[PDB]
Symmetry: D2
């Protein structure tokens, strides 16, 4: 079924996760035609500034995510940054996420694959669609069976990203494809106004799921504040993508 | 608002070719009554990469052929101009005067088109940012244009490749009606990939635009221009139906500019 | 000999041309190892805004340029925008310049070639280095014998240009190569601070000439005010490029 | 200031290979006394495109081989780290700790390198704008780094291609010493063109930088990595002489930051 990966960008507090998990749980019951996966990072290991919010550590993060899964029965996904983290994270994460800048780090991919969990690799901003074939091959060699590739924009000049929708059908040749509606519109070093329009494009073109960050009060977010979606708007967007997918899917090209 | 579909053979290979495509466009205009069809074909390919490539049979021949399409089928017409002097003669038959992408900044060409009283559709240059088109529209309005369109046809992305930044659709909608060129957007400059034409057109309509531009030919493989990207005429009907369906379902979500 | 194409961006007045022509004439006498060509546009036919300075017309422009050639004995170059202009412009222009946006307009190139004058084509911001082979072929077909290709930057994301110096040796395979030090640093829709550094790069890599716009008071320029070089700084930069070329030329690769 | 030349085989194919290149670098360091040579070689290629490509013989073997180069030739050493835990062991032999381009934003890796007390050279990510490196240097200074270098190695330009924006040299010089990577800048990601190595290095020195990074191998065609871009060892001397000459003549024109 269609995958919807959503949650607050960073684990600002297990409290925040619970509030967002509650809504995601509700939508989960309302849209049985969708597989929801709760996402949140225990650490922002690649911030531009040394003075920016990183998180409360792996232990606190895995604990809070464990709370969400136990209290709501929702699948979990979070990203790892160094090989040693794969094992402890796999204790709770159904899907281990690989950061865009780290999509070429062989040991991180192999460590993720070794856990037996599904792996979702964020496509590096420096990678071409066809360059992802090798990424999948690494994961398969490592024993991974459920593999996702996420479109999150490509470097387009300085401090800007562009989404080449041709990437969706190309990557689909070797993995399930997810469209990251949040990071794709962020200006490195974004505009929330383009989030919905581009997500409509993604489903019209055809993808296996959508990744969207949501926060009760985006303005107060300690990360991706400019692009996280207000929690209250999540339901409407999900319904919209299901409606567009229902009609457009008739035209999705084979493989 | 009535959706615009600009379609036809890239170049006026012959008047017969035009009539063949025109006949089909006419049939479709009778079926898709909610669509405003505009027949397109260039009387001259003034910017071919090679001096040895097909250009056309001249303005005179071309205008005459386009006039025949309009007369025999009652279809609106659009063709592009390359130098200021062509605006007047072309305006005699063209309902919409098209401004080539490489020439979108040529002031006199825009002014020549605007003073004819005809609608003007400017292909967004491969070097232009979405917000840079505001001044393009301003020039046209200054010149008397009352019906203006901006066409998205890809942006320079490295060498011999174009990318379509769909954020351009809502941005340009701020000052003009927006058309998505499904054919040129997937071509590889000086290198096109037909397999991406349909998916990207689906994207355009889901994001929201005021029309689509698609070149079609009875036998693309034999086209004298854009042979790699022109759509087989028999596939036009299905593509149009598909975009109307996606447009309908996505429409309630189109943001207000 | 090494070509130096310099002058004010636009023909703001024949007076301005005379003042700049005087200095260029002086440098002309001081640097006999260089072929100076006076440049200035009789019309800015591609301004972004309808309210920006365009010029005083072709007649006034050709007249002022004619004055420079007669009063200083300097070669002339100006750009054309429509085919009909080639003939009248050729009356004074030793080198007919083809605008970057118009580098693919067959009739403009042929009209320029038909005059018998040399032709310098500004490489479009949308063109790849190897794509210029066809541009030269058009000009040769049209009868042109002296052909130049000018590097002036390539579209790099939005409102920015990048100079891929690999273009110099590539274009050299089929034409003489000129480096436009002024437009290459301008931000479409620039930074004078990068003009000198990039011109040093151009000569270290190897080119047949440099194109530089200069104005007595750049701040008062009605065009390219942000990138035109103060007249007083021209001598120093020319001497610098000659010195760097003298040393570096030993390493310029063959063809 | 003494010009830095970082050179050596891309990967530690064997200790013997290192000694062969080291011997030549040593000879050159005796001739070009105004140059500070630093021997470079990766103990691991942790980011190969393919799982089937050569990676290396491990950290232990690599550090031991690099230590042999330093001991036998008295040359400074630099190698790159891929995860935080490698900083300490590598710092035992490396005078300059290199941070991979894809990892230039990984805070812990930068911090791990900085606390060793060794110099740190960060390859500028292909996704980073020149001004975005200010925060990279800030992170290092925060971590205790006192000797920091930023290496220009190209920027993503479309697919499978990199472009070198030389404006980056003067911009980055505002907060760190700048090195130009003549080898990786001409490689075609997931596609390199050796014919552009020398011309672009000439450009770098004419613009002005504090050093150059060039990979060299006795027989590039047989290299287990970067076979298309590593310079034949016999050509190193001539290239170094050329850059010193161009640097000298261009030096009086270098702008003050």
């Amino acid at each position: 079924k269609f995958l919807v990966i959503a949650g607050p960008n960073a684990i600002e507090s297990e409290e925040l996760l619970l509030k967002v998990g509650e809504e995601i749980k509700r939508l989960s019951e309302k849209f049985k035609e969708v597989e929801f996966v709760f996402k949140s990072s225990f650490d922002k290991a690649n911030r531009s500034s040394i003075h920016s919010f990183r998180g409360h550590g792996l232990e606190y993060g895995v604990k809070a995510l464990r709370k969400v899964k136990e209290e709501f029965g929702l699948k979990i996904t979070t990203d790892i940054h160094e090989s040693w983290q794969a094992e402890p994270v796999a204790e709770v994460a159904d899907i281990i996420q690989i950061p865009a800048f780290l999509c070429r780090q062989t040991d991180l991919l192999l460590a993720a694959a070794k856990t037996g969990r599904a792996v979702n690799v964020k496509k590096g901003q420096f990678l071409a669609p066809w360059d992802t074939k090798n990424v999948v091959e690494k994961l398969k060699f490592g024993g991974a069976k459920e593999i996702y590739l996420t479109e999150r924009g490509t470097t387009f000049g300085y401090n800007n990203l562009v989404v080449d929708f041709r990437s969706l059908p190309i990557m689909k040749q070797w993995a399930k494809v997810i469209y990251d509606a949040t990071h794709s519109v962020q200006l490195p070093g974004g505009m929330r106004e383009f989030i919905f329009p581009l997500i409509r494009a993604a489903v019209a073109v055809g993808c296996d799921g959508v990744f969207m960050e949501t926060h009760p009060e985006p303005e107060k977010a300690l990360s991706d504040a400019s692009t996280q979606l207000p929690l209250s708007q999540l339901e409407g967007i999900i319904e919209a993508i299901l409606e567009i997918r229902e009609v457009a899917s008739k035209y999705y090209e084979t493989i």
